[PDB]
A paper describes a structure:
Npro is a key effector protein of pestiviruses such as bovine viral diarrhea virus and abolishes host cell antiviral defense mechanisms. The overall structure revealed two compacted folding units: a protease domain (orange) and an interaction domain (I-domain, green).
Here, we present crystal structures of Δ(2–21)Npro from a BVDV-3/HoBi-like strain to 1.25 Å resolution, revealing a two-domain structure. We determined 1.25 Å and 1.5 Å crystal structures for solubly expressed and in-vitro-folded Npro, respectively. In neither case could we observe zinc binding at the TRASH motif but disulfide bridging between Cys112 and Cys134. Individual C112A, C134A, C138A, as well as D136N mutations in the TRASH motif abolished its zinc coordination and partially interrupted IRF3/IRF7 interactions in the Npro homologs Alfort and BVDV-1 (Fiebach et al., 2011; Ruggli et al., 2009; Szymanski et al., 2009). The unexpected disulfide may point to such a function in Npro that awaits further investigation.
Author numbering: 21 to 168
The structure:
């Protein structure tokens, strides 16, 4: 299974892996002052990193199926998309581009939210033209999509 990470960047099982350098998650980076759920209309901005915003502290953007979005999160998170829980799908009708995530395969993916609420990834680079939807989340944890 792809590992989860605690708020201090330590792996909770398995072995640590580096993020892809082109991901929008840039580590090491603190997080977890508070769990802060936000709606798709109130995603955080870069300029919210040091001050937080009116909603709370900000460490970046986290997502899990539902969809549920967060601007900070304290529990276990993915640093890479757990592709064993995704499924190849056609490209959906996109509502928002939300970042560039490292797959559990080490590759770079563009991440999107679809009009159906699904979270979708598409290979950014070589091997590109692979598109998958996040269909299972058996450990009920988000991906850290962007850090601020
Ligand atoms: Cl997994």
């Amino acid at each position: 299974m792809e590992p989860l990470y605690d708020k201090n960047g330590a792996v909770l099982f398995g072995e640590p892996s580096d993020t892809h350098p082109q991901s929008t998650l840039k580590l090491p980076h603190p997080r977890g002052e508070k769990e802060v759920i936000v709606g798709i209309r109130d995603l955080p901005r870069k300029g919210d990193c040091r001050t937080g915003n009116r909603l709370g502290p900000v460490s970046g953007l986290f997502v899990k199926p539902g969809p549920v979005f967060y601007q900070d999160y304290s529990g276990p998170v993915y640093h890479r998309a757990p592709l064993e829980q995704f499924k190849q799908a056609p490209m959906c009708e996109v509502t928002k581009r939300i970042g560039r995530v490292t797959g559990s395969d080490g590759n770079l993916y563009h991440m999107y939210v679809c009009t159906d609420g699904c979270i979708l990834v598409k290979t950014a680079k070589h091997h590109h033209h692979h598109v998958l939807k996040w269909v299972y989340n058996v450990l009920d944890s988000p991906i850290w999509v962007t850090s601020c």
